[PDB]
Amino acid sequence: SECFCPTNFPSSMYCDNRKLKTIPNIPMHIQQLYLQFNEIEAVTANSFINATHLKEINLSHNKIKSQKIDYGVFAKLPNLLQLHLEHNNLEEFPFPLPKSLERLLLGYNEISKLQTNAMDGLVNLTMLDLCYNYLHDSLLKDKIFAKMEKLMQLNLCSNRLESMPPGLPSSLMYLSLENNSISSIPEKYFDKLPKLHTLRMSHNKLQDIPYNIFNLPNIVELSVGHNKLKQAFYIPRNLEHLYLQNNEIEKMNLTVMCPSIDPLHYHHLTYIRVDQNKLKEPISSYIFFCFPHIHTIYYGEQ
């Protein structure tokens, strides 16, 4: 009676936006369970005991605390693929979790603790969202993501990181580190991240980055706005979108951006954003000969 189970979508149960204080008893045939936007504090075993076929649980926008999640409640679900726990009051990374897990969303919590080996076995994880938490470098230093060899997307934005996370898996394609306090990137950091397509590092403290740190063969989006960069750098062939707003750039040195034109493979660059730098004039018109696909250069004010 508290939830709605449509007869035409019989494996789905909607318990969302109902001011629920507790998770109701879940029938055994339920595969998609929506409990978001409630006032739930605890996740107890008694609610899930027969619900062995759960593939997706949304518990986002609740008041769940780490200490009120019963041991094993998620881990005993052998087909759980997706777990949403964003917008809760979690202080630590939840464990144990089932190894079937593919997508785990933990954004907007208070995660400041991450137990040694908490990520082990999550070898099927493709998406991990930890944005808006309290992570700091010591939690990540032992290469904790390294065995997640299917991980495609890692969101670590709006945390308390001072360094680039070490030993990220080589599968990774999307890395967000926006709104941390990262100031350098170590020399060969990207050597074992050849699949990186999207790198978001806006709102950090980047300044004296290595020459050709961003010479990345599969990068498509590079977002380094609101940092302290003084110079342009070599644009890699694959890049399409470049976000450089709100840095300390006096001139975009076109020769550094493009030292040679190869007319058999033109660079893919399509979009540059450079507003709120210290540029006196537009970039040299010769940019269009190295980057023939440029459709927009946003200058705003400087």
Ligand SMILES: *[C@@H]1O[C@H](CO)[C@@H](O)[C@H](O)[C@H]1NC(C)=O
């Ligand atoms: C779940 O089913 C078991 C039988 O495997 C039963 O003992 C238990 O009481 C049931 N739980 C419910 C209806 O919540």
Ligand SMILES: *[C@@H]1O[C@H](CO)[C@@H](O)[C@H](O)[C@H]1NC(C)=O
């Ligand atoms: C991971 O995914 C594949 C199917 O894509 C499956 O065969 C394998 O059993 C899964 N591993 C775990 C530990 O759930």
Ligand SMILES: *[C@@H]1O[C@H](CO)[C@@H](O)[C@H](O)[C@H]1NC(C)=O
């Ligand atoms: C940075 O993160 C803090 C919390 O860590 C948040 O309040 C702030 O808005 C964030 N800034 C941006 C630009 O996202």
Ligand SMILES: *[C@@H]1O[C@H](CO)[C@@H](O)[C@H](O)[C@H]1NC(C)=O
């Ligand atoms: C471009 O960069 C090179 C090396 O940093 C330098 O020799 C040259 O003067 C620069 N050209 C400009 C700023 O127009």
